[PDB]
Amino acid sequence: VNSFSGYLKLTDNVYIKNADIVEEAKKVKPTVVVNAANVYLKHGGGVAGALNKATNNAMQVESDDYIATNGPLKVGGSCVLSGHNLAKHCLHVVGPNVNKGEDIQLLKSAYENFNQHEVLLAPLLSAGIFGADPIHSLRVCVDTVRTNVYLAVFDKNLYDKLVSSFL
């Protein structure tokens, strides 16, 4: 039993809800919140900009130190950093950004990072401003993640479109 509420169950381990991931994280304070990161951990817009804003820029400060020490992530890769006031940990995961010409096949590799954590609150990787088809992202999520994932979808028409189209 966990404290996630109001989710539709899609499979044994995947759940979905129309929700603002910032507000969800503040309420649940999950062990792991997933950020839709880029390789530079520059949290400017989309989910990343919103999560960072909610931390009063502490996420960005921590991230800049991480990059200065370690260099950029790989597309498809991840790192674990602090969750600040939102969660115990933030798993920064880099899905391919279609608006940069990155290979959509890397989306499966990106979701594989979730399997290192028993339970996660997450967005759909590569959706929104990363330019991928969210129906595809949900399919890859369901077919790749084996741990318990609670997906927060910001857009209602999409949330409704994702549910009604889910196979």
Q: Burial level of 113, CB count in 10 A (0-12/13-18/19+)?
A: buried
Listed ranges 7-15, 57-65, 100-108, 123-131: which one lies at the site for Cl ion (CB under 5 A): 123-131
Strand order in the sheet with 148-153: 8-9, 14-18, 148-153, 119-122, 32-36, 89-93, 78-82
* Binding-site member from 95, 96, 128, 134 for Cl ion (CB under 5 A): 128
Is residue 123 at the binding interface for Cl ion, with CB under 5 A as the rule? no
- Single out the segment in contact with ligand A1A84 by CB under 6 A; choices: 66-74, 96-104, 109-117, 149-157: 149-157
- Rule CB under 6 A: say whether 155 interacts with ligand A1A84: yes
* 21 binding partner (options Cl ion, ligand A1A84, none; Cβ < 5 to 8 Å by kind): ligand A1A84
The DSSP element (H or E) to which 49 belongs, if any, is helix 46-54
Instruction: Kindly state the tokens that stand for 99.
Output: 């608006």
Applying CB under 6 A, among 128, 138, 149, 150 the residue interacting with ligand A1A84 is 128
Tell me which of 46, 76, 83, 95 binds Cl ion, using CB under 5 A: 46
Place of tokens 């950093």: 81
Question: Token pair of 54, please?
Answer: 């909610």
The answer to whether residues 94 and 76 touch, using CB atoms and an 8 Å cutoff, is: yes
Binding site for ligand A1A84 (CB under 6 A): 20-22, 36, 46-47, 50, 123-124, 127-128, 152, 154-155
